[PDB]
């Protein structure tokens, strides 16, 4: 009735996915094998797990998500891991020789190799599904298939269904921290082929995960376990409406042309809170106002792009748990109140409340403390264009020096893809350039 | 029999009517199961004009469910009194409007209207002398308005004699629960000014103000709020439901309320409203509740009588009293603040009484007066629509529905026309 | 006594009558063992006209078993109420027709008819004033029709005064459970147009539609379906079984139903049909069930009254009501959709009532009207027959039975003749 | 009352038979010696084992089938095997010196040697039987008696009874995989002497067994054990109606001139499913629609002849287990729905449902997973003529070179048998050529 499905790519990406399905399975508490601890009573009023966990004729409830990546080592760990009763073989599609972070390889070269298997799996699930709203696709501009092969993936999947929503979680090159140097190539080559195949998607950067887990989670020494846990929470709440009763169970498609008013600049930030320790869970109270005012801390901004340097457009503060329409509401007045913040005035307010009544659940072994209320500030501003500009200037020079270009030209891409894709970020620079212009008079 | 029906869409409104029928059940004291457990035939006398007996005495509503996604259908389907329903009416959607009103009006609007208007029509045959029906949604989106626009058009044509008393939620000036509100709203209100017979304004912030200040409550939700409003919307048919030494129906009301058909957006006042201690401060008199009646703080709408002028004013009284008081306070008040009483409408205040108040209280008051203060309401919402329509902000979600902008101009200079229209009537003597 | 008998062949029909007698047993409340455990003599009053007492009060059916392979004989032989049977009638085959109708009609047709018609004849002597007998098979093959064709010929000659009310399964237009259906069918229907006295159409897809939409059921089988049909075929004799302020028998029915003997293919409607929740939506009135009566969705046959025109229409009512209502709805409806009422048949609707409804319900409705919409049915099946008879597809299975093709022409221009015949009657005034 | 009996020939053929009677005996669970584990209650309504397992005056219930082949080594393994209490000596007839895959040898030369013993055994069983519908005959165009001696076998047995049905299971030369090269000779010499002595029969090819067991059973390295198991399932369900309650217990004779409408081209395909693993039994649901839509996968086509290259004529999707007339029925609408499929239009629909209520039983030590529902798509199309054409072209040239002909001419066949038998496939090529022609206007 209300389905979504997750797709996983790139090393960090399927790392995220593993964390996620660990999470949801924890949260509905269905045991890793595929059974719930106990029988399910027959009831109505709304869906349940049925969105994602797959009903069998018995205690076998597998996700509705798919793995695809050409670097097949790690995924085997899932193939080995505790959830080897959880998942399902045909759920698993991997490539042996990954891209080597040639975008053009797993996009072009090995792009040709596994696509059809992917699409068949997709047809099996969507055919298995009925009211699948949209598509959860995860990848990374690092684990190279996460850029290339995913690029073809949406490039064709969109042309397959279209009417489904594109739920885009991919990681963005951290501003000064990194993984490689061809990242310019991965990213921008992705981007010009990303945009028109993307509906909307958010940009998760890691350095924020570090700084904030270390200060706010009080973390001393983190890694992808903590990161994947954190994105696990954020996606855990970004879709609760289709999973749990909330006052305004807003929906993705609902989000689509309302958060991203124009068609073009359709990405965003997301600073979840309240992430604190057990020793800050106590020694604190964690007000709605604390999560709320705290929600707009630029230093809390969960992607390393200063909001205060940008002007907000929309903010879908979907809330978990014991939320009051009034209290949050006045907090939103407080958000109108913030002098430092500046909004795409031709969209004076574009707010959209989310009050889901389940407060958050915590993953044992985790660092986040337990609370009563969650916020997701999926918000869109002018600010985020800048780091892009760093990307196209860095890539600008490096590409000017023809660095690495032999690698890509060797695999079947043309140079005008490069300069033209730079025209692509040129245009989007005109977009964040223009939409931020205040309409005259 | 002047019986009527209910139809609800609306992100909230679907909940609203749930509370509403809930309340009426209380005033009819029939079990959740659907049989009567009360103490006077009077609850049974006029029971039909909202309810419907069933074979075996299943007593049922004349309600119509609107929704574009079954969750609400499950929700109220999970509702106490849920066994007091008919499974037939659970007419919902598989998609949701996403509140682009064109989506809920063309896309899904045209998609699911048919099954509704059919079964509703089967209810139309179920109605002997249908006084009307009650629609409910919100005027800012599509979860209700998406289709409810089509309802008002279709049934309005299909039943050009029936009353269409329309309550839908108005976006408060301060808090924008969505930014596509000016557009859904304006596109709707173009329709509603043409097609709807009665309308009363549904703000949230007023209801907050009532709960927090005058209710002295800290914890606001919807459900209490729908209690506060279904109190009034439940009062409205009281005489029509029960005897009254001074009775007046919706036809007598609107015809006795509206000078010209474009003025069926009405504001609302209901009372008393206390917290528990208050009774041990104060007691109940007709003059007392009168002293609440003309309270801007009970003025549950974005319009200010303190700023605008009462084009019309009326009182809905349920209880047992002396009208010799009632009128006396009436005229007294019609003098006391004459200036906010429009001039050439002599005795612009008008009266009523129901022999029984609502349950639990001894006397009832209701005020659905109509000033023209709403002009700031339309002016605001039209203004925001103006700004982002300069920007075309989220036109792409919009034109993706395949409407034209010229429609936006139509509801635009339209709605401005209605505003200035109220200006001249307010500015005249 | 106007008592009657049953004879069933048919891949399903052999099951159908199993359910049927099962149902009648319920309405007579006699134990499976064969003795009465009910509460009114009324079940015993007219019990004989279906049943037969035995020495010791074994109460038995007047049924006749047709089959070409004992499996069904074991099946129902494995049947609850199976101890309510007479072992005599278990007349089956050792081969099966393979549904080449010539096989079941010449080959095995001539092989096992004799023992049947003998014992059946012994039942004929067992019948004092036999109103008739009920045959059952399907009109697409040979498992029933194979021999049942021979039955209708033989007994029809043997009893030119007795009523032959024939129900056999019609292949739905969409789903072809076999491709030899046009040929078995056409060859049969040639016979049935000549020899059978009454016929009513037996689609599966309608029964699915009933179970899934209007029954709101997801799991279809035969047995429920035969419940749905043996409901009606069980209703038909109610007055003939029980008193009625307005009674009419099959002779009064058919003679009051058919203008010309070629028109004894009738469509069927029975009701009410709800799922459990529905009663807590709705209740029962004569006007209500009337409002189902003319429902194409209860029109359990491949013909559409919405497309064709009611040549005839009738109502079978079991219950306790006021006919003052009944007629009133009758005439009301005969106006309301006059156009689908054929013209020169004044009062083409006709009435009935049984003082008792069927068990469990308070009021009964049945509709066996006769439009002419079936023309698409014969046109279809004749069409497929036409195509593969151009090909002679599976003629070899066929001519291997040693029939001629000219017979196929006979039922062919035959059946077309019957169709156009219905065309002129439909196209006339 | 409803009897059939099985005949077994050729190396692979009696391999199949061994698998089969292992199977059925498993399925009625009568212990290998000849006894059931427990006493049999007296009841009525339908037959039981009595079809095939032979009642004694005690726990001795032997099949009603017969072994005949001139290569007597392997059959001795049955003569030795665990079921040496099961079978019966006079059930066993073998030849010492087999054909050497001279068709003309065990058909002509050794054809003369064991026939009478065979017919006497047949008279003993059919005389032992009453309502024996038809004849289960198994052989192979490889284990050479499977072609030759079987050819005489039906050639005379048909002329003995006639009115019985001919249930033909024999294997067909795999398209590119093989066993020998005289296979052309075996096959076509069989075929012209096969057709007019055959009622109807199906063509099982192995390469499909391999590819599908390896993908669908997830098999790594199969053999005749897996193959014989698989055909064991398919025949296990092709006759359930006479063994088990089903809604439409269709029958062989029923199938005969209805599936194969004309007399001539009376063979067919058969893609059984659902064959999956224990790890796909879970991680799956196996819908009626899945078996159904899956039933027409050309890649699932259990004989290496593309259905999509042919036009279907009939499809007897007899079903095991919890089947719904409606659900399957709408699936059949779905089959009318399939644009890629094209039907002998003069037979618009020729469908014939089979809904037997027993879902499948599994053989321990097997690779197939357990399910609730079985399909047998005994379907007939235009496609299968082609591989025949390969057979007559291959054989065409090889015979043109007179290859091996000395072997056969040495044993008492004439050349006009060869060229004329090529006229035989000429005619049948005209048959698949003509019946596929769409009737004019
Ligand atoms: Mg990789
Ligand atoms: Mg051999």
């Amino acid at each position: 009735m209300r389905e979504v499905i997750s797709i996983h790519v790139g090393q960090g990406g399927i790392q995220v996915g593993n964390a996620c399905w660990e999470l949801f399975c924890l949260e509905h508490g269905i045991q890793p094998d595929g059974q719930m601890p106990s029988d399910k009573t027959i009831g109505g009023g709304d869906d349940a797990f049925n969105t994602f966990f797959s009903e069998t004729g018995a205690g076998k409830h597998v996700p509705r998500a798919v793995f695809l990546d050409l670097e097949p080592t790690v995924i085997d760990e899932v193939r080995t891991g505790t959830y080897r009763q959880l998942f399902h073989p045909e759920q698993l599609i991997s490539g042996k020789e990954d891209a080597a972070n040639n975008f053009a390889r797993g996009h072009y070269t090995i792009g040709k190799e596994i696509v059809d298997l992917c699409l068949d799996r997709i047809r099996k699930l969507a055919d298995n599904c009925t009211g699948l709203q949209g598509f959860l696709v995860f990848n990374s501009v690092g684990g190279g298939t996460g850029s290339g092969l995913g690029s073809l993936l949406l490039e064709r999947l969109s042309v397959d269904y279209g009417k489904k929503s594109k739920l885009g979680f991919t990681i963005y090159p951290s501003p000064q921290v990194s993984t490689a140097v061809v990242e310019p190539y991965n990213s921008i080559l992705s981007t010009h082929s990303l945009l028109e195949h993307t509906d909307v998607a958010v940009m998760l950067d890691n350095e924020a995960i570090y700084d904030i887990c270390r200060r706010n989670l009080d973390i001393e020494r983190p890694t992808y376990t903590n990161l994947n846990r954190l994105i696990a929470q954020v996606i855990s709440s970004l879709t609760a409406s289709l999973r749990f009763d909330g006052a305004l169970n807003v929906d993705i498609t609902e989000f689509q042309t309302n958060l991203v008013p124009y068609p073009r600049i359709h990405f965003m930030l997301s600073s979840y809170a309240p992430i604190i320790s057990a020793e800050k869970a106590y020694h604190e109270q964690l007000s709605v106002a604390e999560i709320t005012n705290s929600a707009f801390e630029p230093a809390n901004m969960m992607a390393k792009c200063d909001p205060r340097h940008g002007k907000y457009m929309a903010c879908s503060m979907m809330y978990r748990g014991d939320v009051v329409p009034k209290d949050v509401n006045a907090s939103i007045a407080t958000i109108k109140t913030k002098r430092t913040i500046q909004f795409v005035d031709w969209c004076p307010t574009g707010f959209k409340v989310g009050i889901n009544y389940q407060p958050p659940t915590v993953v044992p072994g985790g660092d986040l403390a337990k609370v009563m209320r969650a916020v997701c500030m999926i918000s869109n501003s002018t600010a985020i264009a800048e780091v892009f500009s760093r990307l196209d200037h860095k890539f600008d020079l490096m590409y000017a020096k023809r660095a690495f270009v032999h690698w890509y030209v060797g695999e079947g891409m043309e140079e005008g893809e490069f300069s033209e894709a730079r025209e692509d970020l040129a245009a989007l620079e005109k977009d964040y350039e223009e939409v931020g212009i205040e309409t005259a008079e | 029999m002047r019986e009527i029906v209910h139809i609800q869409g609306g992100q909230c409104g679907n909940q609203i009517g749930a509370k509403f029928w809930e309340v009426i059940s209380d005033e009819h004291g029939i079990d959740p199961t659907g049989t009567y457990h009360g103490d006077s035939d009077l609850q049974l006398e006029r029971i039909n004009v909202y309810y419907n007996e069933a074979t075996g005495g299943r007593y049922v509503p004349r309600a119509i469910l609107m929704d574009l996604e079954p969750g609400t259908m499950d929700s109220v389907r999970a509702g106490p009194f849920g066994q007091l329903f008919r499974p037939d009416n659970f007419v919902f959607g598989q998609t949701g409007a996403g509140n682009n009103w064109a989506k809920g009006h063309y896309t899904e609007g045209a998609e699911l209207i048919d099954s509704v208007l059919d079964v509703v029509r089967k209810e139309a045959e179920g109605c002997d002398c249908l006084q009307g029906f009650q629609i409910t949604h919100s005027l800012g989106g599509g979860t209700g308005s998406g289709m409810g626009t089509l309802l008002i058009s279709k049934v309005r044509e299909e039943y050009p004699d029936r009353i269409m008393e329309t309550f839908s939620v108005v976006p408060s000036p301060k808090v924008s629960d969505t930014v596509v509100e000016p557009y859904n709203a304006t596109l709707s209100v173009h329709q509603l000014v043409e097609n709807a017979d009665e309308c009363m304004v549904i703000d949230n912030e007023a209801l907050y103000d009532i709960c927090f200040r005058t209710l002295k409550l800290t914890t606001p939700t919807y459900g209490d709020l729908n209690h506060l409003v279904s109190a009034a919307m439940s009062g409205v048919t009281c005489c029509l439901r029960f005897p009254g030494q001074l009775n007046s129906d919706l036809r007598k009301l609107a015809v006795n309320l509206i000078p010209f058909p474009r003025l069926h957006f009405f504001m609302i006042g209901f009372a008393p409203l206390t917290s528990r201690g208050s009774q041990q401060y104060r007691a109940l008199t007709v003059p007392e509740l009168t002293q609440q009646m003309f309270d801007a703080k009970n003025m549950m709408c974005a319009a200010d009588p303190r700023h605008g002028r009462y084009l019309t004013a009326s009182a809905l009284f349920r209880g047992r009293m002396s009208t010799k008081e009632v009128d006396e306070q009436m005229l007294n008040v019609q003098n006391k603040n004459s200036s906010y009483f429009v001039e050439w409408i002599p005795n612009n205040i008008k009266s009523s009484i129901c022999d029984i108040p609502p349950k639990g209280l001894k006397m009832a008051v209701t005020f659905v007066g109509n000033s023209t203060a709403i002009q700031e309401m339309f002016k605001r919402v039209a203004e925001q629509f103006t700004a982002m329509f300069r920007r075309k902000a989220f036109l792409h979600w919009y034109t993706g529905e395949g409407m034209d902008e010229m429609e936006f101009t139509e509801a635009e200079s339209n709605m401005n026309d209605l505003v200035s229209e109220y200006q001249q009537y307010q500015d005249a003597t």
Side-chain angles (χ1 to χ4, degrees), chain A, chain B:
Chain A
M1 193 273 175
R2 292 185 294 177
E3 287 74 352
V4 185
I5 51 171
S6 298
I7 298 168
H8 311 275
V9 185
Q11 189 177 0
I14 69 169
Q15 293 297 320
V16 179
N18 187 359
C20 291
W21 293 91
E22 176 177 1
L23 190 147
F24 293 161
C25 290
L26 178 62
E27 188 173 0
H28 301 289
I30 306 308
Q31 293 296 321
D33 56 358
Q35 68 184 355
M36 182 177 176
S38 64
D39 192 359
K40 293 184 264 74
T41 61
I42 297 169
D46 192 359
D47 200 75
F49 64 97
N50 193 2
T51 50
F52 302 102
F53 298 163
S54 182
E55 290 181 354
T56 52
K60 190 179 178 187
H61 307 86
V62 299
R64 299 178 182 89
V66 177
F67 288 171
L68 190 62
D69 191 351
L70 300 168
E71 45 197 356
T73 299
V74 296
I75 181 169
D76 304 325
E77 300 296 328
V78 177
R79 274 67 164 270
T80 62
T82 60
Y83 296 99
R84 80 278 205 96
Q85 297 295 320
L86 180 63
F87 285 172
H88 162 71
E90 297 291 327
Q91 290 174 348
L92 276 297
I93 301 170
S94 66
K96 306 292 293 298
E97 289 182 352
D98 61 1
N101 304 125
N102 180 6
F103 189 79
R105 174 179 178 81
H107 180 270
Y108 283 144
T109 311
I110 311 302
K112 305 300 296 296
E113 289 188 353
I114 58 174
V115 166
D116 291 331
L117 185 61
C118 182
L119 295 176
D120 182 73
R121 177 75 272 186
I122 302 299
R123 181 177 66 247
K124 289 181 177 180
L125 294 176
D127 184 74
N128 202 161
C129 295
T130 301
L132 189 291
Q133 293 190 3
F135 284 155
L136 288 170
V137 173
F138 301 155
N139 53 6
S140 166
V141 65
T145 292
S147 60
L149 190 152
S151 307
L152 184 61
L153 180 275
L154 293 174
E155 180 177 1
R156 64 181 181 270
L157 181 63
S158 63
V159 181
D160 184 81
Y161 300 109
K163 185 174 173 65
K164 300 296 181 182
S165 296
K166 276 72 72 179
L167 281 74
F169 289 170
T170 302
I171 301 170
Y172 181 78
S174 298
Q176 184 63 255
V177 180
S178 65
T179 303
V181 189
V182 300
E183 293 174 1
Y185 296 167
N186 313 319
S187 62
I188 59 91
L189 293 177
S190 181
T191 299
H192 176 70
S193 299
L194 183 149
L195 186 150
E196 184 62 24
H197 293 289
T198 46
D199 191 0
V200 57
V202 71
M203 292 295 103
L204 296 173
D205 193 359
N206 310 308
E207 184 173 358
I209 307 165
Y210 283 144
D211 184 78
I212 297 169
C213 291
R214 58 89 166 175
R215 179 184 296 114
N216 297 111
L217 294 176
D218 291 331
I219 292 300
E220 186 177 1
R221 289 183 178 93
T223 178
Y224 263 174
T225 182
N226 298 121
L227 282 70
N228 288 311
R229 188 175 298 168
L230 184 60
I231 298 168
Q233 295 298 109
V234 59
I235 186 167
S236 307
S237 300
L238 184 62
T239 180
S241 67
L242 309 180
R243 297 178 283 111
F244 293 95
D245 186 359
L248 299 176
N249 296 313
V250 61
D251 296 334
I252 301 164
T253 60
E254 192 175 5
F255 294 116
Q256 62 182 357
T257 51
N258 67 20
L259 271 76
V260 295
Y262 288 161
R264 183 70 67 189
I265 56 172
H266 60 72
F267 294 165
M268 70 288 201
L269 276 292
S270 66
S271 294
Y272 174 85
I275 55 171
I276 65 172
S277 65
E279 66 183 1
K280 268 57 184 298
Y282 311 95
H283 250 256
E284 290 179 353
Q285 178 180 0
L286 293 172
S287 82
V288 179
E290 287 182 354
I291 197 168
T292 306
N293 188 0
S294 300
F296 290 97
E297 176 62 26
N300 192 6
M301 292 296 171
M302 291 294 293
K304 294 295 290 183
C305 301
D306 176 75
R308 292 178 287 172
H309 294 168
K311 288 183 182 66
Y312 295 169
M313 303 178 182
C315 296
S316 297
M317 61 291 293
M318 291 186 287
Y319 290 157
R320 290 181 58 86
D322 186 74
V323 178
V324 169
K326 188 71 173 178
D327 305 339
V328 168
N329 196 355
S331 300
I332 296 299
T334 318
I335 306 304
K336 294 181 181 180
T337 315
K338 190 169 287 291
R339 183 183 296 114
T340 188
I341 312 299
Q342 293 172 353
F343 294 157
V344 291
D345 191 3
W346 67 275
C347 182
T349 60
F351 299 156
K352 186 67 177 67
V353 178
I355 303 168
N356 182 336
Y357 302 109
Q358 175 56 256
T361 300
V362 66
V363 175
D367 57 359
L368 167 58
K370 182 175 73 175
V371 301
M372 292 179 183
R373 293 182 298 281
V375 59
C376 185
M377 177 183 71
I378 300 300
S379 64
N380 202 164
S381 168
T382 58
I384 66 172
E386 189 273 331
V387 302
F388 302 150
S389 297
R390 185 188 68 252
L391 179 63
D392 185 73
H393 178 76
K394 301 290 93 177
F395 162 73
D396 182 73
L397 290 175
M398 286 180 66
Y399 177 70
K401 188 60 70 175
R402 300 296 175 273
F404 295 93
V405 177
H406 73 276
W407 286 118
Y408 283 0
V409 62
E411 298 295 330
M413 183 182 288
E414 186 179 1
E415 178 176 0
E417 298 295 329
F418 299 100
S419 298
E420 191 275 335
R422 183 176 181 270
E423 185 177 1
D424 181 67
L425 273 177
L428 304 177
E429 184 66 26
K430 183 171 72 176
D431 297 329
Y432 281 139
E433 182 174 2
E434 183 178 2
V435 175
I437 204 66
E438 291 179 353
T439 299
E441 292 180 354
Chain B
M1 299 292 291
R2 294 178 292 176
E3 76 285 16
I4 71 169
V5 189
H6 170 56
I7 305 90
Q8 72 183 4
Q11 58 207 10
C12 176
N14 300 308
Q15 297 177 353
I16 300 174
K19 179 68 175 177
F20 181 71
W21 293 96
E22 181 179 1
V23 176
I24 298 172
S25 303
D26 184 73
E27 63 184 1
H28 292 286
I30 286 167
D31 64 359
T33 305
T35 57
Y36 174 85
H37 290 170
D39 57 356
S40 77
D41 56 353
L42 192 62
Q43 281 184 343
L44 299 175
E45 298 293 327
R46 298 290 185 266
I47 182 169
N48 59 0
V49 300
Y50 279 168
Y51 281 165
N52 292 299
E53 176 178 2
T55 180
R58 279 197 274 128
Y59 291 162
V60 302
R62 201 167 317 117
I64 297 167
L65 289 67
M66 182 273 175
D67 195 352
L68 300 174
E69 186 177 1
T72 298
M73 299 296 174
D74 190 359
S75 70
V76 65
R77 181 175 292 173
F81 292 163
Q83 293 83 17
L84 191 144
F85 290 82
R86 290 180 63 184
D88 192 359
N89 291 312
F90 286 88
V91 180
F92 65 99
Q94 296 290 325
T95 299
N99 285 325
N100 184 357
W101 176 68
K103 186 184 291 294
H105 171 276
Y106 306 101
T107 319
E108 285 75 358
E111 184 178 1
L112 292 175
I113 187 68
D114 190 0
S115 296
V116 175
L117 295 175
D118 183 74
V119 177
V120 176
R121 187 175 66 247
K122 175 173 73 176
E123 295 295 329
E125 295 295 329
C127 296
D128 193 0
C129 183
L130 185 63
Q131 180 52 256
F133 52 85
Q134 293 176 353
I135 191 63
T136 301
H137 66 88
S138 56
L139 299 180
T143 58
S145 61
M147 183 176 177
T149 47
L150 296 185
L151 299 177
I152 64 173
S153 297
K154 296 290 95 175
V155 173
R156 182 71 277 165
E157 295 178 353
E158 290 182 353
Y159 296 99
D161 59 352
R162 297 298 78 225
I163 195 166
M164 187 181 290
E165 60 182 359
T166 300
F167 297 159
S168 287
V169 177
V170 307
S172 70
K174 293 169 70 177
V175 61
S176 300
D177 187 76
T178 191
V179 75
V180 300
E181 61 184 1
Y183 290 80
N184 319 304
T186 303
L187 297 182
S188 313
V189 175
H190 171 282
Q191 306 296 321
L192 292 170
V193 298
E194 295 293 329
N195 308 308
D197 311 339
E198 294 179 353
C199 292
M200 296 179 189
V201 172
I202 298 171
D203 183 80
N204 190 358
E205 182 66 26
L207 276 68
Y208 288 165
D209 180 75
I210 304 169
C211 291
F212 179 76
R213 182 178 295 117
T214 190
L215 270 69
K216 296 182 181 292
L217 289 174
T218 61
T219 298
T221 176
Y222 264 157
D224 54 354
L225 295 179
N226 292 335
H227 190 193
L228 272 71
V229 177
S230 291
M233 180 181 178
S234 69
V236 300
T237 306
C238 61
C239 299
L240 199 65
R241 289 175 282 113
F242 291 111
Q245 299 178 358
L246 183 62
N247 291 314
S248 298
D249 65 346
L250 295 173
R251 299 180 61 85
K252 286 189 195 279
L253 285 175
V255 181
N256 285 314
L257 197 64
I258 187 165
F260 303 87
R262 293 183 179 177
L263 280 72
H264 55 284
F265 298 160
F266 305 108
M267 67 194 294
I268 294 169
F270 178 72
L273 276 301
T274 81
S275 298
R276 296 284 73 78
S278 305
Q279 61 183 2
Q280 311 312 106
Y281 262 179
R282 66 184 176 181
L284 296 173
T285 74
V286 178
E288 176 267 335
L289 293 175
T290 315
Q291 295 295 321
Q292 295 187 2
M293 289 178 71
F294 289 92
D295 168 69
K297 294 177 175 65
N298 192 6
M299 297 304 102
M300 296 180 182
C301 301
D304 189 4
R306 303 290 184 181
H307 297 169
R309 179 168 297 169
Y310 283 148
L311 300 174
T312 315
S314 297
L316 268 293
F317 290 162
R318 298 177 69 183
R320 295 176 63 88
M321 59 189 73
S322 294
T323 182
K324 169 64 172 71
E325 295 292 329
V326 173
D327 55 358
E328 184 178 1
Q329 298 295 322
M330 295 298 292
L331 181 63
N332 202 169
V333 176
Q334 186 176 6
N335 316 297
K336 287 183 178 181
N337 293 325
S338 307
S339 296
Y340 298 100
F341 295 106
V342 294
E343 286 76 358
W344 54 265
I345 299 171
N347 286 324
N348 60 1
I349 64 179
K350 172 262 184 290
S351 301
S352 69
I353 178 57
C354 178
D355 196 2
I356 301 90
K359 185 181 289 292
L361 279 70
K362 295 179 181 179
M363 58 184 72
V365 166
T366 298
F367 172 78
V368 174
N370 194 0
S371 170
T372 195
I374 63 170
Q375 300 167 0
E376 295 292 328
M377 176 180 73
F378 296 105
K379 185 183 286 185
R380 177 191 64 249
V381 299
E383 183 180 2
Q384 297 179 356
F385 171 81
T386 319
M388 304 181 75
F389 198 74
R390 302 297 297 162
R391 318 290 289 287
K392 294 185 286 183
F394 282 81
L395 187 63
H396 60 92
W397 291 60
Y398 284 161
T399 181
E401 280 287 325
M403 189 188 287
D404 65 350
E405 295 178 354
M406 184 64 73
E407 181 68 27
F408 293 91
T409 300
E410 292 182 354
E412 185 176 1
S413 299
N414 176 15
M415 179 171 66
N416 298 311
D417 190 0
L418 190 64
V419 175
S420 299
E421 175 181 355
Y422 287 180
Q423 183 57 257
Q424 292 179 358
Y425 283 108
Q426 195 189 22
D427 186 74
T429 187

